[PDB]
Coordinates of C-alpha atoms in Angstrom, one line a residue:
Chain A
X103 CA -7.7 -33.9 24.2
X104 CA -5.7 -33.7 21.3
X105 CA -3.5 -30.5 20.3
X106 CA -0.8 -30.0 17.9
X107 CA 2.1 -28.8 19.7
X108 CA 5.4 -30.8 18.2
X109 CA 6.6 -29.9 15.0
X110 CA 9.6 -31.9 14.5
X111 CA 8.8 -33.9 10.9
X112 CA 7.5 -31.4 8.5
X113 CA 6.4 -33.0 4.9
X114 CA 6.0 -30.3 2.0
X115 CA 4.1 -31.4 -1.2
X116 CA 6.0 -29.8 -4.3
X117 CA 9.2 -28.4 -4.7
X118 CA 8.7 -25.9 -7.0
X119 CA 9.6 -21.9 -6.5
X120 CA 7.2 -21.8 -3.3
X121 CA 7.4 -25.3 -2.5
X122 CA 11.4 -24.9 -2.0
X123 CA 11.4 -22.0 -0.2
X124 CA 9.1 -23.4 2.6
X125 CA 11.0 -26.4 2.7
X126 CA 14.4 -24.2 3.1
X127 CA 12.2 -22.2 5.9
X128 CA 11.6 -24.8 7.7
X129 CA 14.7 -26.6 7.4
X130 CA 16.7 -23.3 7.9
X131 CA 14.7 -23.5 11.5
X132 CA 16.2 -27.0 12.5
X133 CA 13.5 -28.9 11.4
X134 CA 13.8 -32.2 9.2
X135 CA 11.9 -31.7 5.8
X136 CA 10.4 -34.6 3.5
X137 CA 10.4 -32.9 0.1
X138 CA 8.1 -34.7 -2.0
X139 CA 7.6 -34.0 -5.5
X140 CA 5.9 -36.7 -7.9
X141 CA 8.0 -35.9 -11.0
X142 CA 11.8 -37.4 -10.7
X143 CA 13.1 -34.5 -12.8
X144 CA 12.2 -31.9 -10.2
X145 CA 13.8 -33.6 -7.3
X146 CA 16.9 -34.4 -9.6
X147 CA 17.6 -30.8 -10.0
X148 CA 16.2 -29.3 -6.5
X149 CA 20.1 -28.3 -5.7
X150 CA 19.4 -25.6 -8.4
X151 CA 16.5 -24.2 -6.1
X152 CA 18.8 -24.1 -2.7
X153 CA 21.2 -22.5 -4.7
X154 CA 19.0 -19.3 -5.8
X155 CA 17.5 -19.3 -1.9
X156 CA 20.9 -19.1 -0.9
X157 CA 21.8 -16.2 -3.0
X158 CA 18.1 -14.7 -2.1
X159 CA 18.9 -15.3 1.9
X160 CA 22.4 -14.0 1.8
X161 CA 21.3 -10.5 -0.3
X162 CA 18.2 -10.0 2.5
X163 CA 19.0 -11.5 5.7
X164 CA 22.4 -10.0 6.5
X165 CA 23.8 -11.1 9.4
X166 CA 20.7 -13.6 10.0
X167 CA 22.4 -15.6 7.1
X168 CA 25.0 -18.5 8.1
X169 CA 26.5 -20.7 5.3
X170 CA 27.1 -23.5 8.0
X171 CA 23.4 -23.2 9.0
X172 CA 22.4 -23.4 5.2
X173 CA 24.4 -26.3 4.8
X174 CA 22.9 -28.2 7.7
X175 CA 19.4 -27.1 6.6
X176 CA 20.3 -28.8 3.1
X177 CA 21.5 -31.6 4.8
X178 CA 18.4 -31.9 6.8
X179 CA 15.9 -32.1 3.5
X180 CA 15.4 -35.6 2.1
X181 CA 13.7 -35.6 -1.4
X182 CA 11.6 -38.1 -2.1
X183 CA 8.7 -39.2 -4.8
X184 CA 7.3 -41.6 -2.0
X185 CA 4.3 -40.1 -0.6
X186 CA 4.2 -42.6 1.9
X187 CA 7.4 -41.8 3.2
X188 CA 7.0 -38.4 3.2
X189 CA 3.9 -38.6 5.5
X190 CA 5.3 -41.6 7.6
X191 CA 6.6 -39.2 10.6
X192 CA 4.7 -36.2 9.7
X193 CA 3.7 -33.6 12.2
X194 CA 2.7 -31.0 9.4
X195 CA 1.8 -31.8 6.3
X196 CA 2.1 -28.2 4.2
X197 CA 0.7 -28.6 0.4
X198 CA 2.1 -26.6 -2.2
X199 CA 0.7 -28.3 -5.3
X200 CA -0.6 -26.6 -8.6
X201 CA -3.7 -24.6 -8.4
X202 CA -5.9 -26.9 -9.8
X203 CA -8.6 -28.1 -7.7
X204 CA -9.1 -31.7 -9.1
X205 CA -5.4 -32.1 -8.5
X206 CA -5.8 -30.9 -4.8
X207 CA -8.4 -32.9 -4.0
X208 CA -6.6 -36.3 -5.5
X209 CA -3.5 -35.4 -3.7
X210 CA -5.5 -34.7 -0.2
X211 CA -7.3 -37.6 -0.5
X212 CA -3.9 -39.8 -0.5
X213 CA -2.4 -37.6 2.5
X214 CA -5.5 -38.4 4.9
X215 CA -5.2 -42.1 4.0
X216 CA -1.4 -42.1 4.4
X217 CA -0.6 -39.7 7.1
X218 CA -0.8 -40.3 10.9
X219 CA -3.9 -39.2 12.6
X220 CA -1.8 -36.6 14.5
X221 CA -0.6 -34.7 11.7
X222 CA -1.7 -31.0 11.2
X223 CA -2.9 -30.6 7.4
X224 CA -2.2 -27.4 5.8
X225 CA -2.5 -25.8 2.2
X226 CA -0.9 -22.6 0.8
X227 CA -3.2 -22.0 -1.8
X228 CA -3.7 -18.7 -3.3
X229 CA -6.5 -19.1 -6.0
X230 CA -8.5 -21.5 -4.7
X231 CA -10.8 -21.8 -1.3
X232 CA -9.5 -24.2 1.2
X233 CA -13.0 -25.7 2.3
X234 CA -13.3 -26.6 -1.6
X235 CA -10.9 -29.2 -1.0
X236 CA -11.0 -29.7 2.8
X237 CA -13.4 -32.5 2.6
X238 CA -11.1 -34.6 0.3
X239 CA -8.6 -34.8 3.2
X240 CA -11.0 -36.8 5.2
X241 CA -10.3 -34.5 8.4
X242 CA -11.6 -31.2 7.8
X243 CA -11.2 -30.3 11.7
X244 CA -7.5 -30.6 11.2
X245 CA -7.1 -28.9 7.9
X246 CA -6.5 -25.1 7.4
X247 CA -4.6 -22.8 4.9
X248 CA -1.2 -21.4 5.8
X249 CA -0.5 -18.5 3.6
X250 CA 3.0 -17.4 2.4
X251 CA 3.9 -14.7 0.2
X252 CA 7.2 -14.6 -2.3
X253 CA 10.9 -14.7 -1.2
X254 CA 9.7 -15.8 2.4
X255 CA 12.7 -15.6 3.9
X256 CA 12.7 -12.0 3.6
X257 CA 8.7 -11.1 3.6
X258 CA 7.9 -13.8 6.5
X259 CA 4.3 -13.3 6.6
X260 CA 2.5 -16.5 7.6
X261 CA -1.5 -16.1 7.2
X262 CA -3.1 -19.0 9.2
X263 CA -7.0 -19.4 7.9
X264 CA -9.1 -21.9 9.1
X265 CA -12.4 -23.2 7.6
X266 CA -15.6 -23.4 9.2
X267 CA -14.9 -26.7 10.3
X268 CA -11.0 -25.9 11.4
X269 CA -10.7 -26.9 15.2
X270 CA -8.8 -24.0 17.3
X271 CA -6.3 -26.6 18.2
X272 CA -5.3 -26.7 14.5
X273 CA -5.1 -22.8 14.4
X274 CA -3.0 -22.7 17.1
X275 CA -0.7 -25.4 16.1
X276 CA -0.1 -23.6 12.6
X277 CA 0.6 -20.1 14.1
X278 CA 2.9 -22.1 16.4
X279 CA 4.8 -23.6 13.5
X280 CA 5.1 -20.4 11.8
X281 CA 6.6 -18.8 15.0
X282 CA 9.1 -22.0 15.0
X283 CA 10.1 -21.2 11.4
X284 CA 11.0 -17.5 11.6
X285 CA 7.8 -16.2 10.5
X286 CA 5.3 -13.4 11.5
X287 CA 1.7 -15.4 11.9
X288 CA -1.2 -13.7 12.1
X289 CA -4.8 -15.6 12.5
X290 CA -7.2 -14.8 9.3
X291 CA -10.3 -15.3 11.6
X292 CA -12.8 -16.0 8.8
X293 CA -12.3 -17.8 5.4
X294 CA -11.9 -15.3 2.4
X295 CA -10.1 -15.9 -0.8
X296 CA -7.6 -13.1 -0.5
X297 CA -6.6 -13.8 3.5
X298 CA -5.0 -10.5 4.6
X299 CA -2.4 -9.9 2.2
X300 CA -3.7 -10.6 -1.2
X301 CA -7.0 -9.1 -0.1
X302 CA -5.0 -5.4 0.0
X303 CA -2.8 -6.2 -2.7
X304 CA -4.9 -7.2 -5.5
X305 CA -7.1 -3.9 -5.7
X306 CA -3.9 -1.9 -4.8
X307 CA -2.0 -3.4 -7.6
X308 CA -4.7 -3.3 -10.1
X309 CA -4.9 0.2 -9.4
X310 CA -1.5 0.8 -10.0
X311 CA -1.4 -1.0 -13.2
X312 CA -4.7 0.4 -14.5
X313 CA -3.0 4.1 -14.1
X314 CA 0.1 2.9 -16.3
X315 CA -1.8 1.2 -18.7
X316 CA -4.3 4.0 -19.4
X317 CA -1.4 6.4 -20.0
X318 CA -1.4 8.2 -16.6
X319 CA 1.8 8.0 -15.4
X320 CA 5.2 6.0 -15.5
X321 CA 5.8 3.4 -12.9
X322 CA 8.3 5.5 -10.9
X323 CA 5.9 8.2 -10.7
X324 CA 3.3 6.2 -9.3
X325 CA 5.6 4.3 -6.8
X326 CA 7.2 7.7 -5.6
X327 CA 3.7 9.5 -5.1
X328 CA 2.8 6.3 -3.1
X329 CA 6.1 6.2 -1.1
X330 CA 6.0 10.1 -0.4
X331 CA 2.4 10.4 0.5
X332 CA 1.7 7.2 2.7
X333 CA 5.6 7.3 4.3
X334 CA 6.1 3.6 2.8
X335 CA 9.4 2.2 1.1
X336 CA 7.7 0.2 -2.1
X337 CA 4.9 1.1 -4.1
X338 CA 2.9 -1.3 -6.7
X339 CA 6.1 -1.4 -9.4
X340 CA 8.7 -1.9 -6.9
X341 CA 6.1 -4.6 -5.4
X342 CA 5.4 -6.2 -8.9
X343 CA 9.1 -6.6 -9.2
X344 CA 9.1 -8.8 -6.0
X345 CA 6.0 -10.7 -6.6
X346 CA 7.6 -11.7 -10.3
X347 CA 6.2 -11.0 -13.7
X348 CA 5.2 -14.9 -14.2
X349 CA 2.5 -14.6 -11.2
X350 CA 1.6 -11.1 -12.1
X351 CA 1.2 -12.4 -15.9
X352 CA -1.4 -15.1 -14.9
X353 CA -3.5 -13.1 -12.4
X354 CA -3.6 -10.0 -15.1
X355 CA -4.3 -12.8 -17.8
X356 CA -7.1 -14.2 -15.7
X357 CA -9.0 -11.1 -15.0
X358 CA -10.3 -11.0 -18.7
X359 CA -10.1 -7.3 -19.0
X360 CA -8.5 -6.1 -22.1
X361 CA -6.3 -3.6 -20.4
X362 CA -5.1 -6.3 -18.1
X363 CA -4.3 -8.6 -21.0
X364 CA -2.1 -5.8 -22.5
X365 CA -0.5 -5.5 -19.2
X366 CA 0.3 -9.2 -19.1
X367 CA 1.6 -9.1 -22.7
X368 CA 4.2 -6.4 -21.6
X369 CA 5.3 -8.4 -18.6
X370 CA 5.7 -11.4 -20.7
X371 CA 7.8 -9.4 -23.3
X372 CA 10.0 -8.4 -20.2
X373 CA 10.2 -11.9 -19.4
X374 CA 11.5 -13.1 -22.6
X375 CA 14.2 -10.4 -22.3
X376 CA 15.3 -12.2 -19.1
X377 CA 13.6 -9.0 -16.8
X378 CA 11.0 -11.0 -14.8
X379 CA 11.6 -9.0 -11.4
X380 CA 14.2 -9.0 -8.5
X381 CA 15.3 -12.4 -9.3
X382 CA 16.6 -11.4 -12.6
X383 CA 17.9 -8.0 -11.0
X384 CA 15.9 -6.2 -13.6
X385 CA 11.7 -5.4 -14.2
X386 CA 10.6 -2.3 -13.4
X387 CA 13.4 -1.5 -11.5
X388 CA 17.3 -2.3 -12.1
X389 CA 18.9 -4.2 -9.3
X390 CA 22.5 -5.0 -8.2
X391 CA 23.6 -8.3 -6.6
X392 CA 22.5 -6.8 -3.2
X393 CA 18.9 -6.5 -4.3
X394 CA 19.6 -2.8 -3.9
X395 CA 17.3 -0.4 -6.0
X396 CA 19.6 1.2 -9.2
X397 CA 16.4 2.9 -10.6
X398 CA 13.8 2.6 -12.9
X399 CA 13.8 0.8 -16.3
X400 CA 13.2 3.8 -18.6
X401 CA 12.0 1.5 -21.5
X402 CA 8.5 1.4 -19.4
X403 CA 8.1 4.9 -19.4
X404 CA 5.3 6.2 -21.9
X405 CA 7.6 9.1 -23.5
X406 CA 5.0 11.1 -25.3
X407 CA 2.6 8.0 -26.4
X408 CA -0.8 8.0 -25.1
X409 CA -0.8 4.6 -23.4
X410 CA 1.9 1.9 -23.1
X411 CA 0.7 0.2 -26.2
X412 CA 0.3 3.6 -28.2
Chain B
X1167 CA 4.5 33.5 -26.1
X1168 CA 2.9 32.7 -22.3
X1169 CA 4.6 30.5 -20.1
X1170 CA 4.0 30.5 -16.1
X1171 CA 7.7 30.6 -14.8
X1172 CA 7.8 33.0 -11.8
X1173 CA 6.0 32.5 -8.6
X1174 CA 6.7 35.0 -6.3
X1175 CA 2.9 36.0 -4.9
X1176 CA 0.6 33.3 -4.2
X1177 CA -3.0 33.4 -3.4
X1178 CA -4.7 30.5 -1.3
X1179 CA -8.5 30.8 -1.5
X1180 CA -9.7 29.1 2.3
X1181 CA -7.7 28.9 5.4
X1182 CA -9.2 25.4 6.5
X1183 CA -7.0 22.6 7.5
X1184 CA -5.5 21.8 4.1
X1185 CA -5.5 25.3 2.9
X1186 CA -3.8 26.8 5.9
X1187 CA -1.3 23.8 5.5
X1188 CA -0.6 25.0 1.5
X1189 CA -0.5 28.7 2.7
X1190 CA 2.4 27.7 5.2
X1191 CA 4.2 25.4 2.7
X1192 CA 4.6 28.4 0.4
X1193 CA 5.2 31.1 3.0
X1194 CA 8.0 28.7 4.5
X1195 CA 9.4 28.5 0.8
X1196 CA 10.1 32.2 0.5
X1197 CA 6.8 33.3 -1.1
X1198 CA 4.1 36.3 -0.2
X1199 CA 1.0 34.7 0.3
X1200 CA -2.3 36.1 0.6
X1201 CA -4.5 33.8 2.5
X1202 CA -8.2 35.0 1.6
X1203 CA -11.1 33.7 3.7
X1204 CA -14.7 35.1 3.3
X1205 CA -15.3 33.7 7.1
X1206 CA -14.2 36.6 9.3
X1207 CA -13.7 34.0 12.2
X1208 CA -11.3 31.5 10.3
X1209 CA -9.2 35.1 9.4
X1210 CA -9.2 36.1 13.3
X1211 CA -8.3 32.8 14.5
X1212 CA -5.6 32.1 12.1
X1213 CA -2.6 31.8 14.3
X1214 CA -4.3 29.0 15.9
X1215 CA -3.4 27.0 12.7
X1216 CA 0.5 28.5 12.5
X1217 CA 0.8 26.8 15.8
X1218 CA -0.7 23.6 15.0
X1219 CA 1.4 23.4 11.9
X1220 CA 4.5 24.6 13.6
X1221 CA 4.0 21.6 16.2
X1222 CA 3.9 19.2 13.0
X1223 CA 7.1 20.9 11.2
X1224 CA 8.9 20.2 14.2
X1225 CA 7.6 16.8 15.0
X1226 CA 8.3 15.6 11.2
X1227 CA 10.9 17.8 9.6
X1228 CA 13.5 17.6 12.2
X1229 CA 16.6 19.8 11.0
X1230 CA 14.5 21.0 8.4
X1231 CA 12.3 22.9 10.8
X1232 CA 13.9 26.5 11.6
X1233 CA 11.8 28.3 14.2
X1234 CA 13.0 32.0 12.5
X1235 CA 12.5 30.4 9.1
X1236 CA 8.8 29.7 10.6
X1237 CA 8.5 33.5 12.0
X1238 CA 9.3 34.9 8.7
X1239 CA 7.0 32.6 6.7
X1240 CA 4.1 33.9 9.1
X1241 CA 5.1 37.6 8.5
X1242 CA 4.9 36.9 4.8
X1243 CA 1.4 35.6 5.1
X1244 CA -1.4 38.2 4.6
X1245 CA -5.0 37.1 5.9
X1246 CA -7.5 39.1 3.7
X1247 CA -11.4 39.3 3.1
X1248 CA -10.7 41.2 -0.1
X1249 CA -10.7 38.9 -2.8
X1250 CA -9.5 41.7 -5.4
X1251 CA -6.7 42.4 -3.0
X1252 CA -5.9 38.7 -2.8
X1253 CA -5.7 38.3 -6.5
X1254 CA -4.2 41.8 -7.8
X1255 CA -0.6 40.9 -8.0
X1256 CA -0.9 36.9 -8.2
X1257 CA 1.1 34.5 -10.2
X1258 CA -0.8 31.4 -9.2
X1259 CA -4.2 30.9 -7.3
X1260 CA -5.0 27.9 -5.1
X1261 CA -8.7 27.1 -4.4
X1262 CA -9.0 25.4 -1.3
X1263 CA -12.9 25.6 -0.6
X1264 CA -15.3 23.0 0.5
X1265 CA -15.8 20.4 -2.2
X1266 CA -19.3 21.9 -3.1
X1267 CA -19.3 22.2 -7.2
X1268 CA -22.2 25.1 -7.2
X1269 CA -19.7 27.3 -4.7
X1270 CA -16.7 26.2 -6.8
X1271 CA -18.2 27.6 -9.6
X1272 CA -19.3 30.7 -7.8
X1273 CA -15.7 31.2 -6.4
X1274 CA -14.2 30.6 -9.8
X1275 CA -16.3 33.2 -11.8
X1276 CA -15.2 36.0 -9.2
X1277 CA -11.3 35.0 -9.5
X1278 CA -11.6 34.8 -13.7
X1279 CA -12.9 38.5 -13.7
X1280 CA -10.7 39.5 -10.7
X1281 CA -7.2 38.1 -11.4
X1282 CA -4.5 39.2 -13.8
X1283 CA -4.5 37.5 -17.2
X1284 CA -1.1 36.3 -16.3
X1285 CA -2.2 34.0 -13.3
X1286 CA -2.2 30.4 -13.1
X1287 CA -5.4 28.9 -12.0
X1288 CA -5.3 25.7 -9.7
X1289 CA -7.8 23.9 -7.6
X1290 CA -6.8 21.2 -5.0
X1291 CA -10.2 19.4 -5.1
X1292 CA -10.5 15.7 -4.2
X1293 CA -14.1 14.9 -4.8
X1294 CA -14.8 16.5 -8.0
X1295 CA -13.6 16.4 -11.5
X1296 CA -11.9 19.7 -12.6
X1297 CA -13.4 19.9 -15.7
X1298 CA -16.7 20.0 -14.0
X1299 CA -16.0 23.7 -12.7
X1300 CA -12.8 24.7 -14.8
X1301 CA -15.4 26.6 -17.3
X1302 CA -16.4 28.9 -14.6
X1303 CA -13.1 30.4 -14.1
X1304 CA -13.6 31.6 -18.2
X1305 CA -10.1 30.3 -18.7
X1306 CA -9.7 26.6 -18.9
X1307 CA -6.4 27.0 -20.9
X1308 CA -4.6 28.1 -17.7
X1309 CA -6.9 26.1 -15.1
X1310 CA -5.6 22.9 -13.7
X1311 CA -5.7 20.7 -10.3
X1312 CA -2.9 20.7 -8.1
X1313 CA -3.7 18.1 -5.4
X1314 CA -2.0 17.7 -2.2
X1315 CA -2.4 14.9 0.5
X1316 CA -2.6 15.4 4.5
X1317 CA 0.3 16.8 7.0
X1318 CA 1.8 18.3 3.8
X1319 CA 5.0 19.3 5.3
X1320 CA 5.7 15.7 5.6
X1321 CA 4.0 14.0 3.0
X1322 CA 4.8 16.4 0.6
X1323 CA 3.3 15.2 -2.9
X1324 CA 2.2 17.6 -5.5
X1325 CA 0.1 16.0 -8.1
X1326 CA -0.7 18.2 -11.3
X1327 CA -3.7 17.2 -13.2
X1328 CA -4.8 19.3 -16.4
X1329 CA -8.0 19.1 -18.0
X1330 CA -8.5 18.5 -21.6
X1331 CA -8.1 22.3 -22.0
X1332 CA -5.2 22.8 -19.7
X1333 CA -2.2 24.1 -21.7
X1334 CA 1.3 22.5 -21.2
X1335 CA 2.9 25.6 -20.2
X1336 CA 0.2 25.9 -17.3
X1337 CA 1.1 22.4 -16.3
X1338 CA 4.8 23.1 -16.2
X1339 CA 4.2 26.3 -14.2
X1340 CA 2.1 24.2 -11.6
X1341 CA 5.1 21.3 -11.5
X1342 CA 7.8 24.2 -11.1
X1343 CA 5.5 26.0 -8.3
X1344 CA 5.5 22.6 -6.4
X1345 CA 8.9 22.3 -6.9
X1346 CA 10.0 25.6 -5.5
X1347 CA 7.4 25.1 -2.6
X1348 CA 9.6 21.7 -1.2
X1349 CA 7.2 19.1 -3.0
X1350 CA 7.9 16.0 -4.9
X1351 CA 5.8 17.0 -7.9
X1352 CA 4.5 14.6 -10.4
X1353 CA 2.1 15.1 -13.7
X1354 CA -1.1 13.0 -13.8
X1355 CA -1.3 13.0 -17.4
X1356 CA -5.2 12.5 -17.9
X1357 CA -7.9 13.9 -15.9
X1358 CA -9.0 11.0 -13.5
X1359 CA -11.4 11.5 -10.2
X1360 CA -8.4 10.1 -7.8
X1361 CA -5.2 11.2 -9.2
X1362 CA -2.3 8.8 -8.2
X1363 CA -2.5 8.7 -4.6
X1364 CA -6.2 8.4 -4.0
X1365 CA -6.5 5.9 -7.0
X1366 CA -4.3 3.6 -5.0
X1367 CA -5.4 4.8 -1.1
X1368 CA -9.0 4.3 -1.8
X1369 CA -9.4 0.6 -2.5
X1370 CA -6.7 -0.1 -0.4
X1371 CA -8.0 1.5 2.7
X1372 CA -11.7 0.2 1.6
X1373 CA -10.3 -3.7 1.8
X1374 CA -8.6 -3.0 5.0
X1375 CA -11.5 -1.6 6.9
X1376 CA -13.7 -4.3 5.2
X1377 CA -11.6 -7.0 6.6
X1378 CA -11.9 -5.5 10.2
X1379 CA -15.5 -4.3 9.8
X1380 CA -16.4 -8.2 9.0
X1381 CA -14.3 -9.5 12.0
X1382 CA -11.6 -11.2 9.8
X1383 CA -8.7 -9.4 11.8
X1384 CA -7.7 -6.8 14.3
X1385 CA -6.4 -3.4 12.9
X1386 CA -2.8 -4.5 14.2
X1387 CA -2.9 -8.0 12.7
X1388 CA -3.7 -6.3 9.0
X1389 CA -1.3 -3.6 9.1
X1390 CA 1.7 -6.0 10.6
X1391 CA 0.8 -8.3 7.5
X1392 CA 1.1 -5.6 5.2
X1393 CA 4.1 -4.5 6.5
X1394 CA 5.9 -7.4 6.4
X1395 CA 4.9 -9.0 3.1
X1396 CA 5.3 -5.9 1.2
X1397 CA 8.2 -4.5 3.0
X1398 CA 6.6 -1.1 4.2
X1399 CA 6.4 0.9 7.5
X1400 CA 2.9 2.2 7.4
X1401 CA -0.3 -0.4 7.0
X1402 CA -3.8 0.8 6.3
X1403 CA -4.8 1.6 9.9
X1404 CA -1.6 3.9 10.4
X1405 CA -2.7 5.3 7.5
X1406 CA -6.1 6.0 8.9
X1407 CA -4.5 7.8 11.8
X1408 CA -2.7 10.0 9.7
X1409 CA -5.7 11.1 7.2
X1410 CA -7.5 11.4 10.3
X1411 CA -10.9 10.1 11.3
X1412 CA -12.8 13.1 10.5
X1413 CA -12.2 12.7 6.6
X1414 CA -12.1 8.9 6.7
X1415 CA -15.7 8.8 8.4
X1416 CA -17.0 11.0 5.6
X1417 CA -15.8 8.8 3.1
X1418 CA -17.0 6.2 4.6
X1419 CA -20.7 7.4 4.8
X1420 CA -20.2 8.8 1.1
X1421 CA -20.2 5.2 -0.2
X1422 CA -23.6 4.4 1.4
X1423 CA -22.8 0.8 2.0
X1424 CA -23.9 -0.5 5.2
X1425 CA -20.6 -2.0 6.8
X1426 CA -18.8 1.2 5.9
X1427 CA -21.5 3.1 7.6
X1428 CA -20.9 1.1 10.6
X1429 CA -16.9 1.7 10.3
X1430 CA -17.9 5.5 10.1
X1431 CA -19.9 5.1 13.3
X1432 CA -16.9 3.3 15.2
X1433 CA -14.4 6.2 13.9
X1434 CA -17.0 9.1 15.2
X1435 CA -17.3 7.1 18.8
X1436 CA -13.9 7.5 18.7
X1437 CA -13.6 11.4 17.8
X1438 CA -16.0 11.9 20.6
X1439 CA -13.5 10.4 23.1
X1440 CA -10.7 12.8 21.6
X1441 CA -9.0 10.1 19.3
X1442 CA -9.2 11.4 15.9
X1443 CA -5.7 10.0 14.7
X1444 CA -1.9 11.5 14.9
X1445 CA -3.4 14.9 15.5
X1446 CA -4.4 13.9 18.8
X1447 CA -2.0 11.3 19.6
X1448 CA -4.3 8.3 19.1
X1449 CA -6.6 6.6 16.8
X1450 CA -6.1 3.3 15.9
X1451 CA -2.5 3.4 17.5
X1452 CA -1.3 5.5 20.4
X1453 CA 1.5 8.1 19.4
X1454 CA 3.8 10.5 21.5
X1455 CA 4.7 14.2 21.3
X1456 CA 6.8 13.1 18.3
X1457 CA 4.7 11.2 16.6
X1458 CA 6.0 7.7 17.7
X1459 CA 4.0 4.6 17.4
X1460 CA 3.6 3.7 20.9
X1461 CA 1.8 0.3 20.3
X1462 CA -2.0 -0.5 19.1
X1463 CA -5.0 0.7 21.0
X1464 CA -6.6 -2.8 22.4
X1465 CA -10.3 -1.1 22.3
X1466 CA -10.6 -1.7 18.4
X1467 CA -9.5 -5.5 18.9
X1468 CA -12.2 -8.3 18.3
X1469 CA -11.4 -10.2 21.4
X1470 CA -14.2 -13.1 21.2
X1471 CA -16.6 -11.0 18.8
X1472 CA -17.5 -12.0 15.8
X1473 CA -17.4 -8.4 14.3
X1474 CA -16.5 -4.9 15.8
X1475 CA -20.2 -4.5 16.0
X1476 CA -21.0 -7.9 17.9

């Protein structure tokens, strides 16, 4: 029989903010990586992203971060705009291209035609159902979702979710890959939109931002209540800061709900001021170079206004 | 003018699970407490609650637990079945009686007639809107809600939520009272059913148990994913263990949703075996005498079954 147990060569499709984190995560664990992107400009300035991840790593991993390891990881990364080359020796493909269905189908048709028959196919999608484009690959039995969070070095969940077609060997292989790349692997046993992480996070974040937008409390009040009453360390607005404002704005905008559109507008105004989250050192909270919380940003607070808008 | 700035005498209405916890919170912080109950058995067996509260204090407060202080706190509590005696010198009344609207209104009518004109009125309701029975006290301007969590010595949040009639001075007094009884006080600036805590908790726990009941993952997988990805220490099922299966099964039955009924029926089976959560040392997880988590309990795990019922 056939069973994906060897993961020495990795192909990652797309070199964006998540793509590059995924690439570095595999490279930093001693795996050769073809960093594929169709846009040459993105390839050319990829050193920018190794430096940013590098500063993320050091500030969060403490002693798990070895600058010699990071350089060897960089040296194991081969950027390329040739799909055939990216796939030629690939044991696993991790597609992380934009969340547009027609773009997924087109890239996956090419991957199924170019990649070896023994290659595990994985998508990182957060906004589409994997079974909605698994057929475009030509091999849905080897096709699953492998889902990450943000700043994956620190928040190293890997959620493996097959479709109805995905073989158990494929599920096991993807969970093995996650284990070999420093991740905490979990098996999402049915195909659902939000996996585990986003199924919990979306209702929680929504409720948090609803209380703020309706003038019921300040971000720090909501987070503190959550921390103290549940014994947790990070509440909704500390979590927004880690998710980052760009992704949070889009989600909030895609709801269609007025009050969530207001929330998105406030996040975008703060993106404009250079304050999009922990990656800028400021969002709802102020952060140092360590990533430590230096306290809440008071300009969010309601004061005596009814709501953040009025 | 009027401003509730002295809290020496406390009346707590109801000596149940939460009521007794509120009674001990105040007395442990140097306040005389009249512990009122119309049920003679609750009063005669009230030392049971002190001993159950004592164990929790010790297991969670660590160095903040002083057995001599606990004794002086017990000696400051006066169990009584005379409402008039309970209220006679009361600076604040905290009503902790069952969540029945008619019973609320009747109790608060008696309180409004018997209490001093300077007494602050607070309810701890979790399932009713305070303005639905505020008028029954006759004095809605000094009537607000003061909302606790479970095991309040460790989960020491206090949410102060006025109605539209609540005066600011009453809000300030409720917040000062919480400050003087060892809580983290927050102001819920608009009357809403879920305060901060329950507003965030209910959709979170709902999504948690919905994943498990539909066979998408095991309790430990869902909690682990939440912990690692969000940087937190307690997932939804660690939280169910703390909230306790009795409350959890009730809120699940209250929705009327079939799968939540099934979840409640599983919680109730586990109650029958002596595993209702942390108070028993076991629920979704096993615990020690100190409250340490010793691992998930395997019986909830899906194994090869499609859902926890099949």
